[PDB]
Amino acid sequence: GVKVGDVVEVKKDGKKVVARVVELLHDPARNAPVARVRFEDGEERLILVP
């Protein structure tokens, strides 16, 4: 149920940190939503939506 602008916790360099959801995509292979998240410093990452 994660949507654009929401905030989630992920690991970055062994530390639990907050990232902001900037985009919702879909992985046809895993048949599951994927979110483009952006960290405080501007780094981005793709994460499978829990």
Numbering used by the authors: 3 to 52
Give sentences copied directly from the paper behind this entry.
Given the high similarity between the OB and SH3 folds, they are presumed to have evolved from a common ancestral protein. Loren Williams’ group suggested that the four-stranded core fold of OB could have transformed to SH3 by a simple circular permutation (or vice versa). Following this evolutionary hypothesis, we tried to convert the reconstructed OB proteins to the SH3 fold. While design-23 had a random-coil structure, design-24 exhibited a CD spectrum for a folded protein and remained almost intact even at 90 °C. We also determined its crystal structure and confirmed that design-24 adopted the four-stranded SH3 fold. This experimental conversion from OB to SH3 strongly supports the previous hypothesis that these folds could have emerged by a simple permutation of their four-stranded core fold. In contrast, the reconstructed OB and SH3 proteins did not interact significantly with any oligonucleotides.
Here, we study fold transition between distinct β-barrels by protein engineering and structural biology technique. Here, we discover that the previously reconstructed ancient DPBB sequence could also adopt a β-barrel fold named Double-Zeta β-barrel (DZBB), as a metamorphic protein. Furthermore, the reconstructed OB fold could also be converted to the four-stranded SH3 fold by a simple circular permutation. Thus, these ancient β-barrel folds (DPBB, RIFT, OB, and SH3) could be readily interconverted by a few feasible mutations through the missing-link fold, DZBB, indicating their significantly close evolutionary relationships.
